[PDB]
Design a protein around this ligand. Structure first.
Ligand SMILES: CCN(CC)c1ccc2c(C)c(CCN3C(=O)NC4(CCN(C(=O)c5cnc[nH]5)CC4)C3=O)c(=O)oc2c1
Lengths: 215, 215
């Protein structure tokens, strides 16, 4: 029982080389075969690497797998990037009876310039508090590529309960927007000194914080 | 080298049984194990069956896998169809020289009940006003089907500039969420008595109103 940790995203221009790392949390990376899967948006998954570095028939030489024992990491390298390489890439392995997939890496083959998001965090409105709702909204606009990861904190502690995040959406300026909202009760909201919204984009992380007031 | 062929789509009504076939193109279906994965749009896939007919820990017992040796096919059978079962389903087997996936079957669950949206309108945050921004956000959640019209008002008049609405995305309750945001300056925000977000869904309107803080 172990995790495989991949970064959330990578991006490059057509024709360049990109590397996707996959770090095993406990145990040796070399003691079990590592596979790589590609899933293009709205497509079936395809195996691009099995047994660490083996390509199935039809998978071009541009895809290369490797293992690094000292890092305890596997890597998928894609050279001569093409637009059709734009996909989610997952590593998986085993130990004992456990099958383990990594969390996935979104690879974007850049189709326009990179744009860091505007992150605005809204505390509960008066209208919803009178309805025993303390829902928070994290608004994320004007970003590219259209992939983000959102994490919420109550004080310092992570929150998984009550989190919904929209699929990013192309807006009229041709950049992506999304919202994350946290469905709190006024009780939970007033019982903490602050809440935070963490937005990660192109491996850059921004944190916004709000505290209960009165007014 | 073999392939797995699944229907592109199946639609069925709630409480009824649906089958999804997965045909192996060469060799015997019984010579390697078959997995089934479920994928909701937006999310990573989830394992529903391994070793032909085994369910992992989270998975409703309404999900059953089977092997038919004569037709050289695997089947996923979902009894008592729930709207939460609407998703893409992929079968998967092994070729020793590959991990093979089917093309995917899109499962539509028909006659989903209507659900009016929860609407919440947030005035500008303190933090954004300190950075000379007065963006307003209207969270629109828990609605079905997944289309809304959003109109904004300054006092009682239609707003014609600065409105973005995101494409509704299905959330973890299998209902849609979106947010509409209006990018005002501090001046526009305080030059008016109020702003309003008007949401229409299935011929029914909801209108929320907010006004500059008095503190
Ligand atoms: C596109 C690549 N792909 C194939 C469709 C992925 C890509 C990613 C996943 C993930 C994230 C999970 C969910 C998390 N998860 C694991 O990492 N391992 C298991 C552990 C439990 N389990 C088993 O006990 C099992 C036994 N034999 C196979 N699976 C299912 C896999 C799991 O639930 C998963 O179950 O399946 C995945 C499949």
């Amino acid at each position: 029982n172990f995790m495989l940790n991949q970064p959330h995203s990578v991006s490059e221009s057509p024709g360049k080389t990109v590397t996707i790392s996959c770090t095993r949390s406990s145990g040796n990376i070399d003691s079990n075969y590592v596979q790589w899967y590609q899933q293009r948006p709205g497509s079936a998954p395809i195996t691009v690497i099995y047994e660490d570095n083996q390509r199935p028939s039809g998978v071009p030489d541009r895809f290369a797998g490797s293992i690094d024992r000292s890092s305890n990491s596997a890597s998928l390298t894609i050279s001569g990037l093409k637009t059709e390489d734009e996909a989610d890439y997952y590593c998986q392995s085993y130990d004992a009876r456990n099958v383990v997939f990594g969390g996935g890496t979104r690879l974007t083959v850049l189709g326009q310039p990179k744009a860091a998001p505007s992150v605005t965090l809204f505390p509960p409105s008066s209208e919803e508090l009178q309805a025993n709702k303390a829902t928070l909204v994290c608004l994320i606009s004007d970003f590219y590529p259209g992939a983000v990861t959102v994490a919420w904190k109550a004080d310092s502690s992570p929150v998984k309960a009550g989190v919904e995040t929209t699929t990013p959406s192309k807006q009229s300026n041709n950049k992506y927007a999304a919202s994350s909202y946290l469905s709190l009760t006024p009780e939970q909201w007033k019982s903490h000194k602050s809440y935070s919204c963490q937005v990660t984009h192109e491996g850059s992380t921004v944190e916004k914080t709000v505290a209960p007031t009165e007014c």
